Every structure is written in structure tokens, then in C-alpha cells.
Symmetry: D3
Subunit: 145 residues, 6 copies
């Protein structure tokens, strides 16, 4: 497990862009991670997306996954960042199904695929109550701000 403070030792992200509230399982060997992001109406983006109809942005669901991928990529090499960041460089298959709503517990999954040099590929899935909500193959480049 990992609470918000540990999470913040791995991600430089801060308000209003830290989209991982907890990491429930770190399958150290399976090279995969399970974490969630509580979706609440008391978040800053809801008012603008959209007035009268709150729907968590999809791009934000993407960002949530990449952030989880990042944590994983670090724990795998049993290290503690320095600044060091898994820069979101691209993505292939990227899809959404049902929309995420206030009150939902966005579940995040990321599985290690490859890594050619500095590039990393992850297979990420976001789900609400087991029902799939998003899926994409995230691509990151280990960089240093």
C-alpha cells in the first residue's frame, strides 16, 4: 500500500494535478500496479466540465493512469526519484466507455510491457466497480525536470 505522502515522494505532481489518491497493490514481480483516485464533486475541474453536468474529463483519466504507471516504473527498479519524471510522450490505443461521475472510485491499473532505452510502455486500464471505463497503452520517457 501507499498513502498520499508516499505517493508524493514518487510523483512531483501537486494540486490541482495529483490524480492518484491511493495505491492498494504493488505487484512487485507481476510488474503491475493497482491504485485509485476518489472522484468527488468538491474538485476544481467539475465546475467547468460541465456546469449542471459533472463528468470527470477523460484526458484527466489518462493523466491518472500515467501517474500510476510512473509510480510502478520506479518501484520496479527499487529506487527513489531525485525531479525525475516519467514524461507522457504518447499513446496508441486509447478508449473510453462509460463516463466517470462524482462519487465514483476510479480504479487504476498499469502493467509493465517493454522499455527500449529510455522509453517505457504500459498497458493501463481504468475501471469503476469492475466495469471498464478507459483503456490505453501509455508511453513514457524517463526524464528530469
Amino acid at each position: 500500500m501507499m498513502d498520499i505522502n508516499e505517493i508524493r515522494e514518487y510523483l512531483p505532481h501537486r494540486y490541482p494535478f495529483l490524480l492518484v489518491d491511493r495505491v492498494v497493490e504493488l505487484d512487485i514481480e507481476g510488474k503491475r500496479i493497482r491504485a485509485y483516485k476518489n472522484v468527488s464533486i468538491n474538485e476544481p475541474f467539475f465546475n467547468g466540465h460541465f456546469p449542471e453536468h459533472p463528468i470527470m474529463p477523460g484526458v484527466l483519466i489518462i493523466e491518472a493512469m500515467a501517474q500510476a504507471a510512473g509510480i510502478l516504473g520506479f518501484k520496479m527498479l527499487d529506487v527513489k526519484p531525485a525531479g525525475t519524471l516519467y514524461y507522457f510522450v504518447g499513446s496508441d490505443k486509447l478508449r473510453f466507455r462509460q463516463p466517470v461521475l462524482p462519487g465514483d472510485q476510479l480504479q487504476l491499473h498499469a502493467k509493465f510491457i517493454s522499455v527500449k532505452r529510455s522509453i517505457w510502455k504500459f498497458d493501463c486500464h481504468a475501471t469503476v466497480d469492475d466495469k471498464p471505463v478507459c483503456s490505453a497503452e501509455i508511453i513514457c520517457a524517463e526524464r528530469k525536470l
Copy 2:
């Protein structure tokens, strides 16, 4: 059972002070309600309470409870307009364990009575079924603007 949109039809509260994200059960016959508030680090009060140690203000837990009760009240009398149940007191209130980002604050409100338009509710808040806060909420019907 009601989502954020239904919730906002009974509570006049708005961002950044709407602290009930969903109502799982509204037993109008038993005159009680069960709902919750998702605690996320991505909320505006965390940066200030406290930097480097996110802890949901207890006063917000009270606020979340009073809002839970409020929904029940409005429902009990089909009260829509906007006026609310003005939080006027509590004889006893206690906190146990702090609430943290990631928690799902479970809210319980049970209608007790109403004399002179003064409502008393019996509320409890819990996380992972462990008790977090309990208190007797006193609200008094009033029109916003009075």
C-alpha cells in the same frame, strides 16, 4: 438512491462547500439517510490543512453530516426555491480517527424530532466501518435572505 445532480436539487450548497457526493439509501419511512463523501487529495482545502500532512478538517466532517441530514429533511417535506436547514447547534460532538485522502467518508443521519421548526438529527460518520465522528445535529428551517 440519488446522485450528485439529484443531491443538488435539495441542497443549495455549491463548490467548494458541497460535501455529500452520493446518497446510497434514503429510507423516508424510517426517517434516516445513508450517503458518503469521497475524500480526494485533489480538493481545495488540503493545501491549507495541512501542507505536507493532508487531513480532512473535522469541521468539514460535521458539515458533511449536517448536509446529509439536510437532504433527508428537504425530502421529508418536498422542499425545493432553495432555503436550507440552518445549522444552529450540537450538544455533544466527538471525533475518533482523522479522515485522510483516499477514504470514503460514510455519512449517517437519523431524524429524531422537530419542535418549533427546530430539527434534531442523530448523525455518525465512519470510514471502513470504523467510527470517525458522531454528533447530534440541530438545524432550524429558514429562508435564505431573511
Copy 3:
């Protein structure tokens, strides 16, 4: 007198949860404190409490008193804080009238007793010397 920066040396709270704008009197022999919070429509919480009807949340009034209480606690023992007085409970908490934009929320906190790490304060809040809220605040002095 204590300006906002001295207050921030004692209270770890920050925007948008620092609810004491100035400490005006500190009576240590009598174990009481007088401070205040300025209410302004230019505060983040007003847009949501409530649209077209700005009223300072009662819970925030409580928060302001608990915060003033803590300053008093540290002051009573010459402490120069990572200690925090956690709000662990309250007895007979009551609100008389609502606090509105333009008001100067006066905060009074008086030491009642202490049993180890559990402190009890007698608190009141007033606008133009009129009662607005009162309660017995219970705090637990703990490491943040």
C-alpha cells in the same frame, strides 16, 4: 498584538484554512485570548455557501475559534512550535446569528482545564460585540 506572520509561526494552517487574521489581546495571567477574522466576499467559500446568499459556514466559525484556542495554549506555556491542537470534540455548541461579508468576527477563547494531552477551552465569537456562536472546544495536543 500578533500579525499574520507570527500567527503562521504557531498555526500550521494555510490557505484556504487559516481563519485568524489578527490576535489583539493575550491575557496569560487570565488564560484568555482575543483575536479576530475579517469576513470578506473575496473568500473562496462564499461562492458555494451560498450562491446569491453569502453566509459564513458555522463550521468555519468553529474552526476559527479552535485555531485561536491553540495559539492561546502555546502562549500559556512559552512554546515556540510541529505541534497541533487537534479538534477532537465539542460540548453545547450553539449559533445565534449568521456571520456576513463585512463582519469582523471576534474570537474569544478561555482556558477551562487540561488533563495531559487533552485541552478544554471556553469559546465565543461575536460580531459588533453581539453573540454569534459559543462552545466548549476540546483539543488534543499532538505531533502534526
Copy 4:
């Protein structure tokens, strides 16, 4: 006296740019107003001006003054939902910084209007000491 709800009926400004918390006196006879803005540490502009040193931006003191003038203007012509656009000032001066916990007193005295160009004599004070003073010039629009 005018509370915040009435003020919001004469000014189109809304959070985070409504800088008049209360109108204590509105002298329609003398064509002048007396209002104030409560300065609290819980305002959005303090974190950025400045970290460790909270000082109300002089420009917001100017804006607060212009806004008090605007309430006078609208009262005078009984204007409901236009705007009193800030077009200038000739001599503007700041004497001391305004800090958290200060009650920013705002004074506006109507001077004249010609071709829809309004001119007001403004002053701001804290604990009755002078903080700012300037001649605000506005022009109706929208």
C-alpha cells in the same frame, strides 16, 4: 447602509474581483460614498503577493476605490443590469501598505460628468491613516 447583496445589485463584479464588502454611508445629497473592504488572509491573491509577506496589491486598492465610485454612480442614475469602465487617473499615490486584518476604508466623492465621462475624488484609509488617494476617471459602456 448597503450590505453585500445590495452591492452586487449595482456592480457586475464577482469573485475573485468584487472588492467592496460594505457601504456604510451613501450620501446622495452630497454626491459621495463611504464603504470598506475587509482584508483577510483567506483571500486568493495573498498566496502570490507575496509568499511569506502578505501585502494587498496596490492595484486592488485602486480597484476597490473605483468600485465604490461605481456604486455611487449607479445610485445617482439608478442604473441596473451596465459598467463604469476605468479609463484613467492623473495623480495616484500610496502612503503605506495594507495588510491582513486591516479594514480598508473607501471614500468616493462625485466631481463631475461630461460626455458620459465621470470623474471621482477618491481616498482609502486604514485606522484613519491615509493609504491611497487618486482621481478616478470612468466612462459608461456595455
Copy 5:
């Protein structure tokens, strides 16, 4: 040639999630649009992404493009989308980021119409700063109504 007010007539997005500041060219016969988003340090997301190292989130560039696409949509089918109607971002194949967008940059947004089988629309979008390629992707929206 649309300003911010006209834009808010087509997109239901509002603060802090409206990322199209101006439409410089709307070529309907060419089924393509050109708009931009002024990037300023004075925006809510920079403090969190990242402290002392401001970099516009890539995901927000994707969002900016999906918004420009939506504006092109409505204009194409000559409608006045005054009814919460929206182009719900459903997916995207091949998405790339070629360099960080920083404050002061003027995010140039380009969206080219492609297909439209049933209610699912497809757009070929590119983002550039100082004419240099920044991002590129294939946005797939699914017209629905909130």
C-alpha cells in the same frame, strides 16, 4: 474568426476547462479549423504541474484539440448548439507529444475533418508552437447531449 464569447456558444466547457481562447480561421469548405490557446503562467494547473517547473500537461493539449474539433463539428452541420449538446471524447489511436509547451507559448490548434460513421466523428489534429510541431493525434468524438 471567433472570439471567446462566440466560442462559449458552441462549447459548454467553462473555467477551469475551456482551452480554446480564439478561432483565427474556420474553413468549412475545407472541413478544417485553426485556433489557439494562450499559455500563461497565471493559470490554475501550473502550480501543480510542476512546482518550479511549469509545463502545460500533455493531456490538456489533447483536450485543447478535442475542443477545437468540436467547434468545427457544429459549424459544419450549420447548427446553433444551444442545448448542452456536446462531442464526447471517446477515443484516439496513435497519439504523440514532441516537446513541452511552456508559459508564453501560443498553442496553435489544428483540426481536420476525416470521417463520420453514424454518430462517431473522426478528426486529424495537430498542435504547434512557433510553427514547430508539439503534439499530434487522431481525435474520435461521439456526439451526444449532456
Copy 6:
């Protein structure tokens, strides 16, 4: 040229009051400076100034000019960064606005050293959009310790 980080080494201003997004020209010999501030609808003040009619507060334009002047002041005397010094805005003359700045505009900031009497500086300042005048004033500062 100066990017946002360099700018933040000279100016202590932070969100939401940093109004210089980039410095394009620093002419020491001529004692002038050219910088700009990107105006985006995605900024905290627009919602309040005004709802449905976004206009950049003229006073913020003043602030933006004073901030650019400060940078000029330091560069002129080769003053190394974070000095803990602030060019405190203490007064002005001939302040005039000729037209509103709107979302999408790139506010151009010009500041020209006029004279210095010990700690009191005077600058000749102008702001423009698309090279057309928007604001002008003589900015008087007092170099003091933050």
C-alpha cells in the same frame, strides 16, 4: 530572452499575481524592456470580471507594467536575482486606458527608465495589443526590501 523561471528569480510574485509571462527584449544601453503577458480565458480573474463578458482588469495591466519595470530596474544595474528586493509600486501619473484587453490577446509590455532619486524610480510605461495602444502611465516605484 527570459523565460518564466528566470522571471521568477527577479520577481517574488507568484500565482495568482505574476503577470509577466515572458521578456522578449532587454535593451540596457537604451534602458528599455519589452515583455508580454498572454491573456487566456483560463485565468482566475475572468469569472469575476465579468460573468459572460471577460475583460482583463485595467488595474492588472498596471500591475503587469510595474512588474516589467522591476525586471528592467534590476537588469540595468546587473543586480543578481533573488536579492529579497521589491520595486514597490508607490504612485503614478497620467494613467490612461485606451481599449480593453480580451482573452486571446497578447498584452505587450513596454517600460522605459526615466529617472531615479535614490530609491524612488520613475518609469515611462506602455501596454499594447497588436501594436495598437491599450494602456499608458508613468510608474513610480520605491526599491525596498521585501
